[PDB]
């Protein structure tokens, strides 16, 4: 895992390692992760134009490992070249099945609702990054608790919670949604920020803390 950062005006590479990891001494290993040539951070972009991929300048992103992966040579090699592909790999890659986004939001808690799609040309669509995490939360919420053919106790009792719209039913629904969202270890916490009623319609929203 890693933290994101950006190059500030005339910040030296010594200064970053000292602020995040404490000891300045660690900058030496920290430059290999960002694959930098000797002018590790340089102010001017027309100087980055010298050989763009092997440098960082003012306004560019940087990668900051956690201290345990700082010394790992494999983490060094991977972070050297992958660069922005970090987030995608770290959140993982999967087949996209939100083909009919307008449609699956008309019949949730019913089956047969999702389907493969095609993007690009001649290849099934795929999803990655934060979109993948959303899609997976979405599918997990719209699936009943014991309906996947292996590893059951997956999904929700959202199909079971339909009731007289009195507030206790609404707190129950809130708690089920929060449990469902907090099931995945990748997510830190969820919390409600609004619940709202319109006769026979529930509405509400939840904030979820995704790890960096």
């Amino acid at each position: 895992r890693f933290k994101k950062h950006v190059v500030q005006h005339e910040e030296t590479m010594q200064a970053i390692a000292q602020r995040y990891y404490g000891d300045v001494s660690y900058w030496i290993d920290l430059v290999e992760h960002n694959n930098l040539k000797y002018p590790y951070l340089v102010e001017t972009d027309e100087e980055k134009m010298k050989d763009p991929e092997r440098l960082a300048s003012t306004g560019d992103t940087l990668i900051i490992p956690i201290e345990s992966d700082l010394t790992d040579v494999s983490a060094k090699e991977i972070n050297s070249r992958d660069k922005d592909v970090l987030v995608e790999l770290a959140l993982g890659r999967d087949l996209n099945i939100t083909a009919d986004e307008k449609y699956f939001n008309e019949h949730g808690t019913s089956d047969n609702i999702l389907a493969f799609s095609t993007n690009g040309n001649g290849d099934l669509d795929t999803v990655k990054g934060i979109d993948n995490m959303k899609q997976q939360l979405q599918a997990r919420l719209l699936t009943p608790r014991g309906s996947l053919m292996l590893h059951p106790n997956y999904g929700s009792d959202l199909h079971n919670l339909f009731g007289l719209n009195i507030p206790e039913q609404a707190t129950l629904i809130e708690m089920e949604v929060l449990r469902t969202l907090t099931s995945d270890n990748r997510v830190k916490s969820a919390n409600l920020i609004d619940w709202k009623i319109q006769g026979n319609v529930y509405s509400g929203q939840f904030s979820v803390e995704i790890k960096s």
Binding site: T12, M13, Q14, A15, L41
Partner: protein, 105 residues
């Protein structure tokens, strides 16, 4: 990085307008100038580590390791060219031998 950027963040970084004489600015300027000259020297050191750009003593070392020593009053370019060429003798062929005679001539 360079000596100005890292040095104690409360110290000055530019000439004083109150007076012309600034021992602070003289010291920092001298140290900046020396360490940037050392930096230029160290960047130029990369060229001496390669036979393609090594000159003077490092070209001589390369020649000595390849066994091609420097001829009296021989400049760097011809000496490098002979050193590189020396590994393509293709000895034993008749046209090779003719080339070696043309070189010797």
């Amino acid at each position: 990085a360079n000596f100005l950027k890292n040095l104690h963040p409360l110290l000055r970084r530019d000439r004083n307008k109150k007076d012309n004489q600034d021992p602070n600015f003289a010291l920092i300027d001298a140290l900046n100038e020396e360490m940037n000259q050392v930096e230029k020297d160290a960047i130029e050191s990369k060229l001496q580590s390669s036979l393609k750009t090594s000159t003077s003593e490092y070209l001589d070392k390369f020649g000595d390791w390849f066994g091609v020593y420097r001829k009296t009053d021989e400049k760097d370019d011809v000496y490098r060219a002979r050193i590189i060429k020396y590994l393509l003798l293709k000895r034993g062929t008749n046209n090779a031998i003719i080339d070696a005679i043309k070189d010797y001539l």
